[PDB]
Design a binder for this molecule. Sequence first.
Ligand SMILES: [Cu+2]
Ligand SMILES: [Cu+2]
Ligand SMILES: [Cu+2]
Ligand SMILES: [Cu+2]
Ligand SMILES: [Cu+2]
Ligand SMILES: [Cu+2]
Ligand SMILES: [Zn+2]
Ligand SMILES: [Zn+2]
Ligand SMILES: [Zn+2]
Ligand SMILES: [Zn+2]
Ligand SMILES: [Zn+2]
Ligand SMILES: [Zn+2]
Ligand SMILES: [Zn+2]
Ligand SMILES: [Zn+2]
Ligand SMILES: [Zn+2]
Ligand SMILES: [Zn+2]
Ligand SMILES: [Zn+2]
Ligand SMILES: [Zn+2]
Ligand SMILES: [Zn+2]
Ligand SMILES: [Zn+2]
Ligand SMILES: [Zn+2]
Ligand SMILES: [Zn+2]
Ligand SMILES: [Zn+2]
Ligand SMILES: [Zn+2]
Lengths: 335, 335, 335
Amino acid sequence: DADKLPHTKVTLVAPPQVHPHEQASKTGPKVVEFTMTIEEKKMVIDDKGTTLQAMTFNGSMPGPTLVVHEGDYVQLTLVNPATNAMPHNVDFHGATGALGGAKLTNVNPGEQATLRFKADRSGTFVYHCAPEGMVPWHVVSGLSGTLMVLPRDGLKDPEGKPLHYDRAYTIGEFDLYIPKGPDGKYKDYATLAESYGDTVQVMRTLTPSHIVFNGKVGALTGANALTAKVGETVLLIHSQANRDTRPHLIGGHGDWVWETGKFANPPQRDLETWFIRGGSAGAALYTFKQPGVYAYLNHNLIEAFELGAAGHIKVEGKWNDDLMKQIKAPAPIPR
Amino acid sequence: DADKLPHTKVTLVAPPQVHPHEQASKTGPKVVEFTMTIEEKKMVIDDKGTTLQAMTFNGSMPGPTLVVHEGDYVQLTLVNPATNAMPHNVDFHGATGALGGAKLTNVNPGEQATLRFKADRSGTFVYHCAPEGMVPWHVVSGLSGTLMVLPRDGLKDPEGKPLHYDRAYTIGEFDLYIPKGPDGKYKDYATLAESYGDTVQVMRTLTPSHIVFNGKVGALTGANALTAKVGETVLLIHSQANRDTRPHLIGGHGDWVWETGKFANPPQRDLETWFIRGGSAGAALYTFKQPGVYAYLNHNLIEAFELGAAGHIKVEGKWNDDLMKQIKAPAPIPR
Amino acid sequence: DADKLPHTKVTLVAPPQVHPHEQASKTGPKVVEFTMTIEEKKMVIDDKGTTLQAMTFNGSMPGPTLVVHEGDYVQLTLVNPATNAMPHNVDFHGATGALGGAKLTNVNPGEQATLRFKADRSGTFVYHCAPEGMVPWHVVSGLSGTLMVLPRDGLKDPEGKPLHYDRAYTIGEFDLYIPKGPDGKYKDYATLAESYGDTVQVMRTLTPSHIVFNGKVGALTGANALTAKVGETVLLIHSQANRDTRPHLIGGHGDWVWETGKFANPPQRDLETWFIRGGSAGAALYTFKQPGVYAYLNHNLIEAFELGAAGHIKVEGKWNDDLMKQIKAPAPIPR
Ligand SMILES: [Cu+2]
Ligand SMILES: [Cu+2]
Ligand SMILES: [Cu+2]
Ligand SMILES: [Cu+2]
Ligand SMILES: [Cu+2]
Ligand SMILES: [Cu+2]
Ligand SMILES: [Zn+2]
Ligand SMILES: [Zn+2]
Ligand SMILES: [Zn+2]
Ligand SMILES: [Zn+2]
Ligand SMILES: [Zn+2]
Ligand SMILES: [Zn+2]
Ligand SMILES: [Zn+2]
Ligand SMILES: [Zn+2]
Ligand SMILES: [Zn+2]
Ligand SMILES: [Zn+2]
Ligand SMILES: [Zn+2]
Ligand SMILES: [Zn+2]
Ligand SMILES: [Zn+2]
Ligand SMILES: [Zn+2]
Ligand SMILES: [Zn+2]
Ligand SMILES: [Zn+2]
Ligand SMILES: [Zn+2]
Ligand SMILES: [Zn+2]
């Protein structure tokens, strides 16, 4: 019985970080409380100055990652401020009933609601907005993120041995549908409502103009690259709420991967490239053995290098000649 | 030896139902006899009045589901009436040899043939027409369905424990390629042969105009919604003979799923969204715990809500506040 | 320590064959030496005379398959002759560090380099060229192939029982992006550099003009069909370095399949159609039980029959009436 359990309040953090949490816990079930606020905002998504009339949870794409343990209850307060123009709600793939909660969280601008559900299944699960008659537009404009429900005794390999991570990162991949004018340049709209009709026409072609990690081309590069060090194990959470993708770490692997994202199933090992189905989140563990700059990308290489689906991980530490060695550097062909 | 076994005759039923059958059986192997008749027919596929020059098994899209047990023999009589214009045949992915049977069932209008094959592998398998030189057109125009071969001792979980369903439903998803004229409206053709050339041109773009469950937009809604009740376990069979899809139950899950559709492999549990490869059938079990109207859809949300890949399940019974509760209804933001 | 182990030199062979090798071996770890030479060349890819300005490893699409055992070291010499125009390198998905080796193998025309890496993970893995700023163009123009790393004690089923193959075949599937002129005919270019700008524009549509096995439409048909015989077990290696595909054997199955391509994971059995993610190689075993001409294809049937993704296997031996029998040949409908 839920209203008799202890409550705890969690403060969310912006992607690509994930808020502090315990993996294996001796703690009993809790009601874990969160809040999120919708923000409609225009956003620059590429190096040409192209804009998207965007819709976000807490101001970011993706929304923040929420983390609980199997058997906890999630209690979310969803706020839709009067500065917004549209109605919104939330569907948790991790929940059971009432269209994932969407039927109980319909909030017009100026309103809020509170939902509770039991997180009775372990894994990474998508959440997204789903207002009647406007579902795909709200999703592709930026309203999605991940709930992670960890098993109470932590992650396990196929033989039941313990697995861990030292840091977690969250990557949301967004297929965007930006309209063009008769001059062949991308259109810039004064309001969110004015972008609607033209955007639906692009969507129906099923061809994205851009595909970006965390809100823009190059979001996870330069000063904003992911980081790690040799010997450290990282969890990479990858959500795609609308379209399939195929993650790959250049110079690495997926040591243990749940591509369907559900921790009660055995992971697979040694993957070069894995597959996240549109409408889900998956998770990969990797332990760095070499330093350097890695690329993490969608391995449809057109989607990655032409359309935007790629980022960087900068890894410090000591080079290992046993794993790889330059025997002869590039030099003229002997004759 | 097959011609020495008992024969039984089965009467097929129209989708989305599946004909009565036993799951676990003590019965020994049988020769199980079926008949199907091809019908070429023009069909309205959307709410605008758009038509498809269609080709069907028994008058429906998909064709009916055929159910036998591992070790039975399937003996099908295929009839091509003289009212049809084209030659046809059948390829069972469940069979071994002769292009799945296609080489032995080539029937011109006015003809019939009878094929027998051993159903020696368990799972859900696609069948489809495949006439030399015209294969993709006949498949995308509607000629596909599912053969289910159940293990003799019923379905099993990864630990070998028994699994069951109380009702089965069959959903065929069809990517359609309808041509347009210079005014930008869909074309209506007087005959099947006249649609051919224009349709090939659309197909080569790889962009469907429509994607529909069971023959039309909204086929599985209103009076024709699927039904169930709290406590009941349903099997959802999903076939796609030409193109990938990603099934999802809104407010539910896949309790146990064989996404590749082959029952001798362990299922996965707790899936949010699964993946049916073009050219296959997969199967999901779910036990309802909450009443209400669920949506069952392809979670490329453009494909579902714009192009047609979505239906409804109406579930009766008692609401469960432990799984989900509205703590505070939508109301003004406190100030 | 690698520079203290025995060295062996291997001679590569052209696809669809794979060079002779042992499956299970009592041999200890070796440094296994290979060489490959890049060849830029114009190539006819269809029956209309269409050309591709191509880039290849050893003159073929795909590149040759390299085979070692888990714990061996791969030592490759990569040569870029002065007759070529562009810089090249190599990224092995099977390797750890330095962008899979790409950072250590940058060779301008007239140069060569030698790389060594430990093949410490079993499976089939893609290798491909990846020059800074030009990655997708070099990959889709033909620069990819497969490294197979076999477990030291051979392939195993989910229960640890031994599995074998009698012959191996390697199939590379290539999505091509050929530009058209204002008359709607495919363009023919005098040099590789002149095709670049127009080709990028086609790539960004994400719609291939052609999809071919081993370099052209019908590559693996007629005199160049694959072969086998009843009772023989074949391994079919399928690589796709840029785009998803869904292999199917018409009249057969995947007896045991590693669709993600990594041999330390249990295979699945009885598959009708499997899935190779863009940016990977997978492997299927099948034992022929019936003679005849099989088709092996991508089961997006438009991609196979309209765009080129299909080949043939000719199988000799004795027909088996227990598995399949024509009960009644095509004949007039009785009245
Ligand atoms: Cu919304
Ligand atoms: Cu959803
Ligand atoms: Cu037909
Ligand atoms: Cu087929
Ligand atoms: Cu290159
Ligand atoms: Cu790669
Ligand atoms: Zn309480
Ligand atoms: Zn509280
Ligand atoms: Zn907890
Ligand atoms: Zn819409
Ligand atoms: Zn650690
Ligand atoms: Zn980069
Ligand atoms: Zn008989
Ligand atoms: Zn009989
Ligand atoms: Zn039976
Ligand atoms: Zn055709
Ligand atoms: Zn039941
Ligand atoms: Zn609906
Ligand atoms: Zn040495
Ligand atoms: Zn040597
Ligand atoms: Zn070896
Ligand atoms: Zn490029
Ligand atoms: Zn053998
Ligand atoms: Zn053929």
